[PDB]
Amino acid sequence: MRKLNPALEFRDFIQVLKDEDDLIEITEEIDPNLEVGAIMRKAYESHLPAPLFKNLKGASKDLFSILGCPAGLRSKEKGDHGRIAHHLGLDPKTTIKEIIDYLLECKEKEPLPPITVPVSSAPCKTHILSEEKIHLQSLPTPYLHVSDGGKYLQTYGMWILQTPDKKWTNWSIARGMVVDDKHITGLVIKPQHIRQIADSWAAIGKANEIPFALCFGVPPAAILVSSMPIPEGVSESDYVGAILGESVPVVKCETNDLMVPATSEMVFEGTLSLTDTHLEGPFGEMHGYVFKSQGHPCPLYTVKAMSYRDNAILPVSNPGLCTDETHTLIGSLVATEAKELAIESGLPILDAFMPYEAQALWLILKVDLKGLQALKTTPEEFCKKVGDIYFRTKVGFIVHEIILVADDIDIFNFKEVIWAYVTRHTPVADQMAFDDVTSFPLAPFVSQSSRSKTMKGGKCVTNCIFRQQYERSFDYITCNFEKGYPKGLVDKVNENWKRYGYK
Amino acid sequence: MRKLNPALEFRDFIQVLKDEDDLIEITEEIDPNLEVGAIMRKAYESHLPAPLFKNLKGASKDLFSILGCPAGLRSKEKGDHGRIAHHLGLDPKTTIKEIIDYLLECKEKEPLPPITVPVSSAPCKTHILSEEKIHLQSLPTPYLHVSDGGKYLQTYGMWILQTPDKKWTNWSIARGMVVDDKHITGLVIKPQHIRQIADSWAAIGKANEIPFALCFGVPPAAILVSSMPIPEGVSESDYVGAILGESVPVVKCETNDLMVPATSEMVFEGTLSLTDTHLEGPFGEMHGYVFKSQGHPCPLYTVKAMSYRDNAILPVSNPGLCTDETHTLIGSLVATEAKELAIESGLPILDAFMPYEAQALWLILKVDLKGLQALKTTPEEFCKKVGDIYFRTKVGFIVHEIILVADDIDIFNFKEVIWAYVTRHTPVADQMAFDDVTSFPLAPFVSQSSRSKTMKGGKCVTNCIFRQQYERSFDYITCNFEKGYPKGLVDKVNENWKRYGYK
Numbered sequence A, B: 001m002r003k004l005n006p007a008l009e010f011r012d013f014i015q016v017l018k019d020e021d022d023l024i025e026i027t028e029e030i031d032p033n034l035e036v037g038a039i040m041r042k043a044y045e046s047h048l049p050a051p052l053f054k055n056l057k058g059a060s061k062d063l064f065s066i067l068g069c070p071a072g073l074r075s076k077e078k079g080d081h082g083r084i085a086h087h088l089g090l091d092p093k094t095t096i097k098e099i100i101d102y103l104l105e106c107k108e109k110e111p112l113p114p115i116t117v118p119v120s121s122a123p124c125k126t127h128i129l130s131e132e133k134i135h136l137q138s139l140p141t142p143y144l145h146v147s148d149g150g151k152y153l154q155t156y157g158m159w160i161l162q163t164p165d166k167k168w169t170n171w172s173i174a175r176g177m178v179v180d181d182k183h184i185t186g187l188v189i190k191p192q193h194i195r196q197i198a199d200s201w202a203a204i205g206k207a208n209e210i211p212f213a214l215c216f217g218v219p220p221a222a223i224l225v226s227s228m229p230i231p232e233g234v235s236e237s238d239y240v241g242a243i244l245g246e247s248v249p250v251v252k253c254e255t256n257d258l259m260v261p262a263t264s265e266m267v268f269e270g271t272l273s274l275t276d277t278h279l280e281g282p283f284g285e286m287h288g289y290v291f292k293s294q295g296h297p298c299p300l301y302t303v304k305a306m307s308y309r310d311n312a313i314l315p316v317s318n319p320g321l322c323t324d325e326t327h328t329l330i331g332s333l334v335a336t337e338a339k340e341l342a343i344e345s346g347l348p349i350l351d352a353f354m355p356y357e358a359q360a361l362w363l364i365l366k367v368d369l370k371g372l373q374a375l376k377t378t379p380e381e382f383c384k385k386v387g388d389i390y391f392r393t394k395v396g397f398i399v400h401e402i403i404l405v406a407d408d409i410d411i412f413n414f415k416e417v418i419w420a421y422v423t424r425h426t427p428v429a430d431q432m433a434f435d436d437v438t439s440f441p442l443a444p445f446v447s448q449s450s451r452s453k454t455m456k457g458g459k460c461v462t463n464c465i466f467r468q469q470y471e472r473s474f475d476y477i478t479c480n481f482e483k484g485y486p487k488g489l490v491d492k493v494n495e496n497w498k499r500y501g502y503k
């Protein structure tokens, strides 16, 4: 077999999953109406191999197969974050701390802007359709959850928009559903960059004609950074090229001057209008609910051209209860930038993480106790400082509870996080509300309350640092096997386990 | 061999665990100093078979073996709460919901007070020691955690105290450690009945000579109800009799008038003094810590006699992180009595449970939404009503957060509980503090703060019921595989999973 580069090539990613027995190619006929979404949910929820649906009801031979669960978790024996590690070309047993640390290190690597390659060398240009051949209702788009407001074609593709001055090209994921044979509608919301750039076009009188492209099965490294809140004005493509160690190969669109990854599976191109809008949603989302008939108008994308590979594959994420891409990518990549913001702001933080079990609503910060002790501060002052740093920034938007814990907690292990949460904070008394800050509108306790109208508040910083830990060493014993007993005893016990009679 | 009655006979319980491959007889030499405790924590934390240590360093042929983890959890195939079910003589696969409901059904049965049996055939009277033969320091008492203040002999035996008027005889578990060759010390705290009854002796001038017995390896149903907060004035023995369907067989102590279970493994008898105290603790406890050198003066029990079976077994609980007897018994028996209290107080609660992952600090109340809606109430009023019922009485003593959820949550499954907790309450805004109620002194966020000195407040009711659920039907889709899709699709996917290629 060829040397695989799963960060760079979506098809190498799929092959490396097959080589690790972490991909099931499903060749019986599967219906895109619900059945694909249900198979995906069963696979996410038991951390099972990713389904590749090779035979969808209503598909043509090229349009399309579906790869579900591209950044779902899997069994610990093969690297439970191996699919995420493969998006970055890392070893599959890389830990989540190492994945986050690698993305931070890559911010100081030289950015490598995309390289234009010839069309004859771009698989995405194998088949090219002009406007009259666009028939979006022909595609076997999945209907992913009961009560969704449409069929969501765009759950794990990349939108490409560029500012009118051409200085900033943004790549990002935002959901999109098929409206009719020529149009898609989807979320284009503050504070996201896709709406900052669409607003720039509106500012020069072009709100109804914003060029875009939509790319599926892009280089896995590019879809991952599409989900990451890197700074405004920074083009994702150049940080993707630093992660890959090589410029992303790109080719020009048929109908506009945007550049798309040459190895994309499918590319749609057209114009977005902020003034022609359409009912969108609802859509089963990252906090685990579909709230019925709770759709709202969103901008319309008019598809004017398409190109695709032979035997094209649509990757799909089907959000809901933990754990799927809206936890493993959205939450971990907020945590990556929250670590970067701690570093920029000089907070004494070792690591940050958004536990999957808290549906990407909790951000845990592991605090360096000696650095905290150097501040000679109190919990009330520190909680305020921390909430003021995060809750009025775009990185903090999705977060509703920031939990502060000492450096003896492995924040990437929810068993330690829930222990430290329940045992180390006094309910209410150790929580600081932040009432003026922008609420995240998708949190269900916001959207199903009168807060949905004010859109402020409902966030807190919770102190799970004991008062003594703000001042000095505080040595207690953690009553479990691995931490509670001396290493020589732990090892003796583990060595004799079988001899005792354990089977 | 014999028909086995594990609720009535401690040795039948051990037998029924051996029959279910849930008990490992360790014949090699094990040191009661740490080694026992570490083996036990390994077993609890992976839900492994209980260890029976038949050869402790320092033991005599009779005093003693140790049975660890008598109500730990085990594999789901065997019934994961089967050890708890065998305490009550139920089928091993009975769920914890069914266990709780069975205990509530037993409240309606005829109580059956204990019956005296002949000494001549009571195994607990096989060996009898007079005062001068009592040498507690010669027993192979375990030293269970690093930095415990002593060796804890009493972690899973029953203290027996009776009121001076003889109307009420209480059976309960409270920790106790060896002080010297004749004395034990341990927790005797308000509001527990051991302290209530001791206080009644002090009120008549007998604070320093309160008779007691301490019994190990009692009928398993008796040790379970000893950990249950049944009402004051009710003698546990009479409810144990209702659960067993027969009176508990008892014999009188050598040195006082209390009655002990005839099939006890070991019995210690003597006098308790409230006003002669000794340093007791620290002890690794139910919330997962040993706080070093944080011992405190507790009463002293003087042992004056002791009786025991041939080849006696000491059952031992070694608390810490989830999950051990301090979560499976203390929490679930609080929940049992909390469900009883909701029935008596007219609250619309279907079930109550204290999740093990929350270290028996959280009580979840599953609220029947038709019943709530018939109250025509608001969250603020209902949370006040609920907190006032529970946190102002003994059954709420250990509980620091009561979480209200609707009847779509399976409160016995922490994956559903954590999802409802994070997505359905607004942090701080949907939490009602109770500042004036008694705090649980063992909660670490109480003990390691200045609340240790006031022992008030730090409790909360958290409302995780959506505002529309107080009013009317609110139908939303839960985005997981079993709840999110029509039953017929769930079943088809499960039927086809192997054929798809899932291995």
Ligand SMILES: Cc1cc2c3c(c1C)C(C)(C)CC=[N+]3c1c([nH]c(=O)[nH]c1=O)N2C[C@H](O)[C@H](O)[C@H](O)COP(=O)(O)O
Binding pocket: A154, A155, A156, A170, A171, A172, A173, A174, A175, A176, A187, A189, A191, A192, A193, A194, A226, A227, A228, A229, A230, A317, A318, A319, A325, A326, A329, A330
């Ligand atoms: C991984 C992922 C990220 C989604 C996402 C999904 C996935 C699978 C869906 C499609 C399955 C559910 C919907 N998502 C949306 C979303 N951001 C947003 O504005 N609208 C969304 O509809 N996000 C997050 C978004 O991609 C990030 O917030 C990026 O930081 C946005 O890029 P930007 O910083 O350049 O604006």
Ligand SMILES: Cc1cc2c3c(c1C)C(C)(C)CC=[N+]3c1c([nH]c(=O)[nH]c1=O)N2C[C@H](O)[C@H](O)[C@H](O)COP(=O)(O)O
Binding pocket: B154, B155, B156, B170, B171, B172, B173, B174, B175, B176, B187, B188, B189, B191, B192, B193, B194, B226, B227, B228, B229, B230, B317, B318, B319, B325, B326, B329, B330
């Ligand atoms: C199962 C169990 C229950 C313990 C317990 C333990 C276990 C294994 C230990 C020994 C391992 C840790 C310590 N425990 C204590 C305890 N209650 C108490 O007052 N002091 C304690 O030291 N409890 C709980 C106590 O038994 C219950 O609250 C009973 O309701 C008290 O009975 P009562 O209602 O008759 O007062």
Ligand SMILES: [K+]
Binding pocket: A171, A172, A173, A225, A226, A227, A228, A229, A230, A236
């Ligand atoms: K992005």
Ligand SMILES: [K+]
Binding pocket: B171, B172, B173, B225, B226, B227, B228, B229, B230, B236
């Ligand atoms: K009791």
Ligand SMILES: [Mn+2]
Binding pocket: A170, A171, A172, A193, A229, A230, A231, A232, A234, A236
């Ligand atoms: Mn961006």
Ligand SMILES: [Mn+2]
Binding pocket: B170, B171, B172, B193, B229, B230, B231, B232, B234, B236
């Ligand atoms: Mn009692």
Ligand code: NA
Binding pocket: A061, A062, A310, A311
């Ligand atoms: Na083809």
